[PDB]
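Memo to structure team: turn this sequence into structure tokens by end of day. - J.P.
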Amino acid sequence: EDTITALLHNNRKLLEKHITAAEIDTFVSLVRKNREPRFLDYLSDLCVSMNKSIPVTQELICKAVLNPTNADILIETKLVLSREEEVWLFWRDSNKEIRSKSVRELAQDAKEGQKEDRDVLSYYRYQLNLFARMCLDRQYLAINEISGQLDVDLILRCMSDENLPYDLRASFCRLMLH
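Reply from structure team:
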């Protein structure tokens, strides 16, 4: 991990020459199917962050992730207006269908008690960070897909006040800022 981190420094011509869609697609699919959102962090590091907005690779990675054929990796929100205090984010865990059952209980799970209920918000924070670091300046064909989601009121209602998010709380602002 450390050697491939040091190879993946600023390095413009390496990003636009020796990196193709196939190897990152295997990195997007095969490594990412199981667990461990540190690989999601390294995928986000490969995407843009040299200093500001490598444009050639950010429009290759987005079509590797944001297509509906590559769904069930990211976590989406719906605002099903159930029963003030209506918001839900939906995640699957390696075997079966949507089940979420809450998001306010994750604030109760933010202190201690579970591991499968504590990995979910960390994975959500990291994929929020990847969405913020996806285009962030000029790439338009994949900023339109993330325009409908978290559009106007959903990003503000999740970032009004809550018991105990700190890093995800900053992740909402970071996705706001771009």
